[PDB]
Structure of (-)-cyperene synthase:
Amino acid sequence: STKQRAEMLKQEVKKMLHDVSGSLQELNLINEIQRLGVAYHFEAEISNALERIYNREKNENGINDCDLHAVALRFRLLRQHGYNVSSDVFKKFKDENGEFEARFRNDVRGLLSLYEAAYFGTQEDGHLDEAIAFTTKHLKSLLPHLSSPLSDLVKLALDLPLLKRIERLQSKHFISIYQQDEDRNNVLLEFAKIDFNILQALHRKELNEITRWWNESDLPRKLPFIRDRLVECYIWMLELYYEPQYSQSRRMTTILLILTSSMDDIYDVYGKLEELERYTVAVERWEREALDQLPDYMRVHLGVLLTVVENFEDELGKEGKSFHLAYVKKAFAELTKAYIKEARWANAEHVPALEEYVDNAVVSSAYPLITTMSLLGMGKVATKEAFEWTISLPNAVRQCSMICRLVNDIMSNQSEQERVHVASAVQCCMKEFSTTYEEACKILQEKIARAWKDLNKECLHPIPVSLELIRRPLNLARAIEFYYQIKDYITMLLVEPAV
Ligand SMILES: CC(C)=CCC/C(C)=C/CC/C(C)=C/CSP(=O)(O)OP(=O)(O)O
Ligand SMILES: [Mg+2]
Ligand SMILES: [Mg+2]
């Protein structure tokens, strides 16, 4: 059947990767495996290969290579795994003063590799800032008169690099483009085609159960004003992590992201502040007895929240790890502590200071709750230390919420401001000094780049936790970039399979 064919292809690819252990073919094969959405099948072998590459790196046993593609791909592959390889290997190509050599203008492959490698630099990284402008200029110059199978890659990359691109949609696009390339591998492409079909089948199957749970719930029939966002809540928990072993982790969190959104609306689109200051204490206490005095719709919403939380506790109690949900309840404690502040600013007719507003909005984005609540379905990574680290609000969690808040704000500050809503970041920054809407938008756009550069730094080897746990903030930051660029996502990532 398909599974035996997939296993045979997996062993074939393992044998080839072993046989190319010393050449650039290893780098190309690892890159193609990662970009085809099958990188998780070869975690151990890829880790060993990258360890060997790092050991023979740093000019200790490294042969000088003039190929921009080879060194750029090596740097990008090593930086994606954690190794702190210095961004100084690009000094060789900066021969003509501080500008890159002109002989690379016509090298579209090396230019694109440098383009994708440059975005992975950190704040302290050098030689990875003017490269973006260089490659942008030359790729735009050479785009109109370029051949189709590589102009497709150029057009796919100019919109967003691999750093800011969700992995599943980019994997689909690369599988679609890789057919036209004449230097491809047939077995790797077939393996990716089979794996994509199986993972898409699993992803489509889970949505059926989630929709069944929503239908059986009391949420949709009553409380009419809630806007149904079940699909756009699964796709946000589909690009965070899509591996099959995390399937149990995608049911439990998506069920609790519709509840955390319904709550946002309950606090801003409507409701009076007197009535909202009694919801916060009810959430903090976390008992059904606190629901007696609440209004009907808040009572129903928080009762459903309590029911789903206790149901999830019952499920994690089989393996003796129910106490993890003793950390989720605390997280929901802070979120309502942030929603209840902004509403007050709505009623007091006050414009918060930018720093205070940003500090409050980092918790009112629910990216801090979504980083704690994603550990529910992790088998061995979910430990007490991991949950304590996640609750302690590390810098990695903070820098993935900056992008959310600041991008949303810029996009959705016109629909709500007409009605009674909390002042957004652009209005807060226009409050001090004197700036226009566009000049404040550019200021708020100059912060997303620094947030991305700060998020790139946290995923290195000086890490308190594992790589699987730290990968989540990066994917959370990538999902706001896909939205603010969606029936195409549903129709050709979940409905239309790959031939
Ligand atoms: C599918 C989707 C968009 C969200 C589900 C997951 C969440 C909660 C993501 C982060 C928060 C965002 C971007 C809310 C947009 S609605 P808003 O701008 O009205 O929220 P606000 O009141 O401004 O915080
Ligand atoms: Mg709102
Ligand atoms: Mg807003």
